[PDB]
């Protein structure tokens, strides 16, 4: 997964 509880990596 990318986006989640610790943020994202755009």
């Amino acid at each position: 997964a990318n986006g989640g509880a610790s943020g994202q990596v755009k």
Epitope: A5, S6, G7, Q8, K10
Partner: antibody, heavy 119, light 112 residues
């Protein structure tokens, strides 16, 4: 430059509720995931909430799940935290913080807003 | 539920000294994408934490090159080549590879 300003903290009786706000400026607010992080009286830091850039996705640790709601207004550049069923263990300084675009992290934090829960 | 532990609890230093602080994670900090989201922050009294080092060794904007980070897997350290009075406060490590968690903090203080 990037600025975040939290406000709204105060004293609330146990079981009660309060809303915190966090004004963002100096960046495109709508492009960044945002967090709420608190620091207890004994000075430990605890992550309390995450919200995706667009607002559809929200994340919480088990300590707060079902009582706290993070939200945001991308037109007004405001991040929010509605706290329900407050407990004495929620007593602490509340900070909002930003997620950088290229790595999972917290680059900028506000000056904070204090919450105290007591009868 | 990734536990972050800091050593030492307190590190007294004299101005001009070298300074080293360690941060141990309960499980690997390597993300599925290969990167290690391990960061360091400094907090002064009355102020919020400020980002110093991100993703193990990257200096954040404005941070002097006196600060460096390294480590791997689960064991990481922040170094200060030469301590100045403005460096004093509490240093925190945190991990963002799983839901965010923070170490308990290492207070850098003036030796007496």
């Amino acid at each position: 430059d990037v600025k975040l300003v939290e406000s709204g903290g105060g004293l609330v009786k146990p079981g009660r509720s309060l809303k915190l706000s966090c004004a963002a400026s100096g960046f495109t607010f709508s492009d960044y995931y945002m967090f709420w992080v608190r620091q207890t009286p004994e000075q430990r830091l605890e992550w309390v909430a995450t919200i995706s850039d667009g607002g559809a996705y929200t994340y919480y640790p088990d300590s707060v799940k079902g009582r706290f709601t993070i939200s945001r207004d991308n037109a007004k550049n405001n991040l929010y935290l509605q706290m329900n069923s407050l407990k004495s263990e929620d007593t602490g300084m509340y900070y909002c913080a930003r997620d950088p675009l290229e790595y999972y992290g917290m680059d900028y934090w506000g000056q904070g807003t204090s919450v105290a829960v007591s009868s | 539920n990734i536990v972050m532990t800091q050593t030492p609890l307190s590190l007294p230093v004299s101005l001009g000294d070298q300074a080293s602080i360690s941060c141990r994670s309960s499980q690997s900090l390597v993300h599925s994408n290969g990167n290690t989201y391990l960061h360091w922050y400094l907090q002064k009294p009355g102020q919020s934490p400020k980002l110093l080092i991100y993703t193990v060794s990257n200096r954040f904007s404005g941070v002097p090159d006196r600060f460096s980070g390294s480590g791997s897997g689960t064991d990481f350290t922040l170094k200060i080549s030469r301590v100045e009075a403005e460096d004093l406060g509490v240093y925190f490590c945190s991990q963002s590879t799983h839901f965010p968690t923070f170490g308990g903090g290492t207070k850098l203080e003036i030796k007496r």
